Structures are given as C-alpha cells and as structure tokens.
Design a protein around this ligand. Sequence first.
Ligand SMILES: Nc1ncnc2c1ncn2[C@@H]1O[C@H](COP(=O)(O)OP(=O)(O)OP(=O)(O)O)[C@@H](O)[C@H]1O
Ligand SMILES: Nc1ncnc2c1ncn2[C@@H]1O[C@H](COP(=O)(O)OP(=O)(O)OP(=O)(O)O)[C@@H](O)[C@H]1O
Ligand SMILES: Nc1ncnc2c1ncn2[C@@H]1O[C@H](COP(=O)(O)OP(=O)(O)OP(=O)(O)O)[C@@H](O)[C@H]1O
Ligand SMILES: [Ca+2]
Ligand SMILES: [Ca+2]
Ligand SMILES: [Ca+2]
Ligand SMILES: [Ca+2]
Ligand SMILES: [Ca+2]
Ligand SMILES: [Ca+2]
Lengths: 16, 16, 16, 311, 311, 311
Amino acid sequence: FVSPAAQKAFQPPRSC
Amino acid sequence: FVSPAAQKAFQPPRSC
Amino acid sequence: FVSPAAQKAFQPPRSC
Amino acid sequence: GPQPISRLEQCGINANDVKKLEEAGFHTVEAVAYAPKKELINIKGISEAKADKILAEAAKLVPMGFTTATEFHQRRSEIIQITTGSKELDKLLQGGIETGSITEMFGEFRTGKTQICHTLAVTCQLPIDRGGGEGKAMYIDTEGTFRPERLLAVAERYGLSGSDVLDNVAYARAFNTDHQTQLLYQASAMMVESRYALLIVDSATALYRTDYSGRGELSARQMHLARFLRMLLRLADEFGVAVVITNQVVAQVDPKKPIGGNIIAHASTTRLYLRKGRGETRICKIYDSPCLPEAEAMFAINADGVGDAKD
Amino acid sequence: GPQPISRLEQCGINANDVKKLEEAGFHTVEAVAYAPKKELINIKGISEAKADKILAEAAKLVPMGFTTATEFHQRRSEIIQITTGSKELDKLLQGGIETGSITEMFGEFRTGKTQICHTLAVTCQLPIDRGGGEGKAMYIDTEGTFRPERLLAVAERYGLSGSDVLDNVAYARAFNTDHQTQLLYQASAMMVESRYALLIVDSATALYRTDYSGRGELSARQMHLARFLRMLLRLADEFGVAVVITNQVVAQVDPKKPIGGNIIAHASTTRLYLRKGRGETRICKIYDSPCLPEAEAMFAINADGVGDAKD
Amino acid sequence: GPQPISRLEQCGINANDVKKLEEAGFHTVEAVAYAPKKELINIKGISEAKADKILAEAAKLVPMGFTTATEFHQRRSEIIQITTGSKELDKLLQGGIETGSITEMFGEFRTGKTQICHTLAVTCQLPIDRGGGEGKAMYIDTEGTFRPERLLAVAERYGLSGSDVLDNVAYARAFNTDHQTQLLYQASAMMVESRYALLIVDSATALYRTDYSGRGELSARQMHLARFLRMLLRLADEFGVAVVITNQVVAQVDPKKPIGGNIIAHASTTRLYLRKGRGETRICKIYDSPCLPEAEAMFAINADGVGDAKD
Ligand SMILES: Nc1ncnc2c1ncn2[C@@H]1O[C@H](COP(=O)(O)OP(=O)(O)OP(=O)(O)O)[C@@H](O)[C@H]1O
Ligand SMILES: Nc1ncnc2c1ncn2[C@@H]1O[C@H](COP(=O)(O)OP(=O)(O)OP(=O)(O)O)[C@@H](O)[C@H]1O
Ligand SMILES: Nc1ncnc2c1ncn2[C@@H]1O[C@H](COP(=O)(O)OP(=O)(O)OP(=O)(O)O)[C@@H](O)[C@H]1O
Ligand SMILES: [Ca+2]
Ligand SMILES: [Ca+2]
Ligand SMILES: [Ca+2]
Ligand SMILES: [Ca+2]
Ligand SMILES: [Ca+2]
Ligand SMILES: [Ca+2]
C-alpha cells in the first residue's frame, strides 16, 4: 500500500 | 529433536 | 596392519 | 512532467481499459507509449484491436520520432545533476549524479556504497541553486542497512529540518527478488502523484546471489535481472528520476570484478568503482561512462555524510 | 511478535498445505511472505496455483510496501541493543549488539571471540532496564568450545540464578556444514514457541575451511555459505533476534584478513576486528558498519566474563 | 561408548554398503552421522539415494539436535581430565589434560614436549581415582623420539607393572605427511575394539615443514594440515579420547611463534607454551583456552618423568 504520509506531496526542506 | 527443557518458555533470571 | 598385541584389549596395569 | 494515463480517456479509450492498464503497472501515457505491442496483448481484457488503438492514440501525445542533435543538446543542457556532497567527487562526475539514467556504484565492503546513497537521499532535496533535485527520494533497500540517523547527520550539514527531510524519503525493504521487482510497480504509481527526483536500489543484486543458486539457475537469474534493470530504465524515462543502484563484488581466482555479469554492465550507463583509501578516505573511479573520462577522485566518509577528504 | 503460520488457515489455506509448508521450514506468516515464489514451487504438494494463493493471502497479513523514513526512524528507535558487559565497548557500538541484524566478530586466536559470545549469551537475559534483551539465547557451536562454567561466572557478576541462566541457553553442536544449516530450520521452530533474543553461530565459517578443500570446491563453498548467511538474515527479520557470528582469519602472503570472502563481507552489517592487546586486554575495532564510525575500543577478558580493562 | 557401524544393518542398510563404508574410514554410527552428505557421495558404491538413507537412519541413533546448557553442564561435569604428573601443573589446567578436545604443546627444543607426552602416555592408564583415564594410549610419532625406557621410569613412580604398561601403548612411526594421515584411519578402527583414552601426535607439524617446501606449496600445506586437524577433532568426538599434539616453533625476524599458522591456532582448543626455566625446571603457560585463565606454572623434568619442581 501507501503510507498516509508517503502519499503527501513534496515539501521544500525548511532551514534550521 | 527438542529437549524436554529446551521446549520450556523463557524465565526471567531470578536474582541471588 | 595391527600387531598381534595391539589388537589385545585393555588391561588394568597391575601394581608392583 | 509526465502525463497521467487518465488523458487517454479524452482520446477515445474506454475508461474500463485504462483501469485494466493501471492494473498492469502503466500509470502515465509514456509508460503505454514506450511499451511494446506484445506487453499490452499479454493483458487479459486487451485484444490486438484495442492494443493497436491504445498505442496509436498514445503515440500522438508523446514525441516518438526523429529530431536533431541540436534540439537534443538543448534539451539535455537543462538536465539536473544532483551533488554528491563532495566538491572533489562532483568535479569527477562533471556536475554530479545525472538524472534520467542508471548509475552503478560497486566495490568491496565498507567502501561507502550505502553511505553515498544516504548522502544522495538528502542532497536530492536541496534547491537546484545549491545543486540538488528539489524532489523526494525513494530508497529501496535489499539488505536492512537503511539508517535514518545518517540522513539527519547530513541534513544538519546542509541546514535542513531533519524532521522534514525524513518525510521525503519513501523507504521500502525488499525481502527477495520477486518482491524487489514488485516494489517497482508500486513505485511507478507514487511518482505520478508526488515529485521524486532520485531512485535508489541498494543493493540491486544482493538478493540475486542467493535466490538463484548455482550455474543451473544462471540463465533464469540474468533474465530476471534484465527485466528489473529494464524496468528501472523505464522509470528513468517516464519520470526523469536518477537511478543509483549499488552492486557487490566477486573475486576472480584465475582482482575483484562486479557481479551481475554482462547484463548489468551494458544496462548501466555510469559505473563507479569505490576502493578503500586510508583511514576514512575512499577512492572513486569512473569505471564506465558515455561522456566522462576515465579518472579517479578521493572522497571520504565523515560524521556528516559523504564529504571531501577532511585532511 | 511474529504471527504463527496457523493464521493462514483462517484466510483460506488448506490445513494440509500448512503442514506441507511447516515441513519445509516455514513456521511464521512472515517466513512465507518474505519467501519467493520459487521456493514454494520447489515444495512437492504445492503448485503454482497454490503458491500464488499462499503468497497473496500472506502478503495481506504483513506489511510489504513503502513507508516513510519518519515512520522507520520511529520504529527503529525502539530497537533493543544488548550490552556486551563492557562500558568502554558499548560506547563504541553506541548502545551494544544491535538486534535484527547480523554482527560478525573475527580475529586471530585467543582474541576473545568465544568469550564475547559467552558474555552475550548471558547479558541477553537481563531486563532491558539493565541493558539486555529479556529473552533466551541460542548458541550454535561448530568447534566444541562451549563452556557452561563461563556462563555461570558471568551470572555471578550480574547477580543471576546460575541455575536459571543455564536454562535459557539452547546449545547445539554442529558437526559439519550440512548439519550447521539443518540446525537453523529447527531453530526457526523453537523461536516461535519461546522468546529467543540472541542467536550465536561460533564459528560460522570454521567448518567451511575443511569440508570444502581446494579451489576446485571454492564455488560450491561460497554458494553453500551464502544460503546459510541468507537463512540467518531471515531469522533476524522473522523474530528480530540478534545474530552474532564469529569468523576465523587467514594470512595474506603477498596482514590477516578474515575468511569467507566477499560473500560474508557483504552479508554482515557490523564487523568487529579483535586484536591482542597486552596481558588480558584486547582491542575491538569497528571494521564495517552502516552507522558507527571507524574507531577502536579496549576491553579485557576477566574471570567474570568480558569486562572493561580492569587496570 | 560409541556405537559400532554394524548397528546400521539392523536399521535397513545393505550389509554390502556397511562394508563399503568401513572401507572409507567410518567404523562407528557417529562417524557416519557427523559426516557430511558430500563425503558419502565421494564413495564409489554409494549414490545420493543411499547416502540420504544412510544419513537419515544414522541420525536416529545419535542425538544431533538442540539441548540446554543445563543438560550440557551436567554431561560435561563427568568428563575425564588426565593428570600430567605434576600437582603444580594440574592446578594450572584445573584438573589436567581434558578429554574430548585437542590440546597443543609448543615450544623451543628441549622444553619437554616429548617428555610430557611420555608422562601422559603412562598416567592415562591409572584408575580415575588416581587421576587418569583407565584406557590405552596411542602414540603417533613423526620424529623417531619415542623412548619406551621413559615410560618404564614413570611406571615405577606410580607403581605399575612396567611390562603391563608397555602393552597399552600402540606406537606408530609416521614417515611423511600422507602416512601421518593414513595412520588416523587405522586409528579409528582400533579405538572401536579396545578402549583408548589418549591420542598423541608428536610432532603434528614436524613433517609439514619439509614435505611442503616454500611459499609456492603453502596453500596445499595448510589445506592438507586442516584435514588432519579436522580428522583428529572427529576422533575426539567419536571416542572421547584426549588429543595432545605437539608443535615446533619458528622465529619472527621483524620472538618465537608456533608454526602451522592460523590453521592450527583456531583448530586447537588449549595451547601450552613451554619455556626453558633453570637447570631442569620448565615453565608452562596457558597460551589459549576457552575456560582457563592466562597463567604460568613451573614444572620440571625428573628421572621419573614429568613432575613438580623437585627443589
Ligand atoms: N557515522 C559514521 N561516521 C564515520 N564513518 C562511518 C559512519 N557510519 C559508517 N561509517 C564507515 O563507513 C563504512 C561503511 O560504508 P557503507 O555502509 O556504505 O558500506 P557498503 O559499501 O554498503 O558495504 P556492504 O557491502 O557491507 O553493505 C565503514 O568504514 C564505516 O566505518
Ligand atoms: N576464565 C578465564 N579467565 C581469564 N581469561 C580467560 C578465561 N578463559 C579464557 N581466557 C582467555 O581468553 C582467551 C580465549 O579466548 P576465546 O576462547 O574467545 O578464543 P577465540 O577467539 O574463540 O579463539 P579460537 O579461534 O581458538 O577459537 C585466552 O587468552 C584465554 O587465556
Ligand atoms: N631421563 C631424563 N632425566 C632427566 N632429564 C631428561 C631425561 N630425558 C630427557 N631429559 C631432558 O629433557 C629435555 C628433552 O625434552 P624433550 O625430549 O621433551 O624435547 P622436545 O621438546 O620434544 O624437543 P624437540 O623439539 O627437539 O623434539 C632435555 O633437557 C633433556 O636433557
Ligand atoms: Ca550496504
Ligand atoms: Ca554500461
Ligand atoms: Ca572459539
Ligand atoms: Ca557488510
Ligand atoms: Ca620431540
Ligand atoms: Ca584455538
């Protein structure tokens, strides 16, 4: 299957 | 085969 | 081969 | 991006057939266009009449004809090259790991194959300005050596939200060679939704040494491996991701050539041979490439991922 | 824990087939899920129709798809790391011997390989609070060097009922390479009943030097060793135990590399190289690991098992 | 004791095959049980069908499965430890030379290797009350240094019929490395009839220095030595005798390590390093052992065999 978070789209990794 | 004691389940080792 | 004495069985060593 | 297969219904294809195609792995118009007539026939609810219609309609949506080297040199100059996290190593690859192609990294144990895959799985999310791919990563692992704590260590180096980076790595543990191929069909589905920029199979040939034993199973081993490597090449054309497979080695007793035989030597476009240097340094070497010259570079494994020789 | 294979009958599998599976080594649903279609075909009373049914039903019971590194970093942070009985050594391994993976300990003679396996066979029964695994131990021994009096000496150190500790160590003496593999099939049965937390094969490659003589039998030697190491990896995934194999060494006359070749170098995830220090001190060294940095520690063999350098 | 191979006929084995097995070295059911399937195939009148039958039937007669450390600690506590004729030395070995295992005694010249083997060849016949083995001795000698007058001198010390003691020592002079191995096949036959309690090969590696010359014959030298040491380990399990091999030394010019390389270092369970003390005193030292701590003792060679430092 697909995870409920793997189906989420890409997110530009915020800095830290 | 299996020993009559190897088939026994785990036992938390008591202190001494 | 085997010796005529090597084929002989064990003997408890007698005291002296 | 790639056109989703739903665009075939708007061209005169029964929406039932699209469902019969999507149950066979095809999710984009490209996947159906690049497919041979033989594959569509092998589908149950598809006949030679439909397959000729499906191929004809799909061919109209994607260019499958001649062009010029000028029009290709233009389209190629805009290709993404993901950085390896090492200035010395990227200068060897003339940019970095190239997308739209299969790259292979083989070598003895400890030579940093899994470590490069962890660095790549992070740097593929940097903005293209910083040398990345601005996409998710997909890490198929056939050994059980995927360590998330090594991704956090690299995110700290590039100053990224370690919690956000681990959300862009779709991890999957393959347990045999059949499961390893099954994961690619599910992979083609995910890449239609999100935007993955790097596919990693490490190791690509680990499970082929044991599932197929002696020489008696050699023929079946390579034909099964050839379909896998072919199915990767299809993902590299469908979605333009970067396929980076790792390979084990074997001694020649007649001094370490990679396994897989000629099936994996021809299929992969770039081959990197990783030696053991000194201490924490390693030596990568362009073993085979269409464009890059044969040369060696020296990188190292540091506490913050793969980086230049910190010496 | 792992689901027993009896749960397949409740999903539409003939209870006769489950008996035909359990006669082939499979005892958990995982063992059947992770198995390739090829292995189930090789069973007599199983056909391609049944095997496709068995694989399909079993796949529904165990996750074999993609997840996220976030969901994997969570599940991994709850993994058990068994202490080695040495504060200096655990600080090298960042916790201790990690479960769910194959660990290898090689070195010259006397370097404490068998001694570490005896300490591990005891400390794997301590509560997790004290750094153990709260499970039984399984000590396959291919040399005849299993000494129970060395387990009692370690139980006295940790204050355990020496009579109770020896009840949690399932000992088995392998006499050749075929018998060594046969013991693993019987091992998969026992781990379903009890709760074993540590598997020890010492030495894993001792019997491969003599059963397979020269180079003429080299190919068959590694293919037989590859199946063994693969069958261990399956136990590490089925039951999540900790596999700790020991390896002999060989000189290179062209200065001591471990035997087994590339087959055992790729298969094992963590390799520990044990040198001889001074007196009773020894020097372990992270030879290969996916996460741990290359570093050395100094432990010692004491009258109460492996412990820190008592100096 | 060990079951003779004739008990296989009563379980459905052709008495012709038993004769074909006994012509291959196997004389006990154990020897056939511990044997791999590969060895039985290498026999002429044996096929894969028979060998699978032979292995299956023999496995029913001898336990080859798991037990518990408790059941093993019990069975081990009743093991025989032959005295070395020295109170100071037995206190080092915690009892004496242990049966069912391979013990190695190496050192420079004159250090008393052959002298210990002569004392052991006598004290192995004392009743267990007095610390012996109540069995015959088998003294394979590859140097020509077997002196019966040294056995009489020890029999006088323990008050034994010197004429009767010399009847319990089966002496054999090996003239090359092939003959040295051939003597072990004949040795397995004798131990079925009588009751031998000690096997002595002195020196085990004397003939390997000269029969195999330079480095060009190094690989073949160790593989031939590995089979010999393996065939000794089989005798220690078949009959539970005590194998006490002696080893020469070699200087390292880069200060005296034993020869044989890693092949003999891993195979032997207990290694005793004998130095030269002062006058007639010598210094033994636990070089390697699974259970004994690293320590030194001081014995001496006296006119009545090996004894304590008479000072
Ligand atoms: N955090 C770290 N810091 C420094 N060095 C590390 C770190 N983690 C691993 N290493 C080193 O990197 C090497 C491991 O490399 P890697 O995991 O890529 O191996 P590999 O080529 O995949 O091997 P195999 O074939 O066994 O899977 C070892 O030398 C190890 O000591
Ligand atoms: N009870 C003990 N107390 C102290 N030291 C001991 C004790 N038992 C064994 N030793 C020491 O530990 C070492 C033996 O280590 P170990 O049995 O692990 O060897 P190994 O690496 O398995 O060797 P091999 O390849 O020969 O099997 C020797 O130095 C021996 O003197
Ligand atoms: N009857 C005896 N009384 C006292 N000392 C003796 C007697 N016989 C031999 N020795 C001494 O014992 C030593 C010989 O030891 P041994 O024969 O065991 O040598 P080794 O270690 O086998 O040597 P090599 O490698 O040359 O064979 C010498 O010091 C010799 O003087
Ligand atoms: Ca790896
Ligand atoms: Ca190529
Ligand atoms: Ca050992
Ligand atoms: Ca490895
Ligand atoms: Ca001598
Ligand atoms: Ca040893």
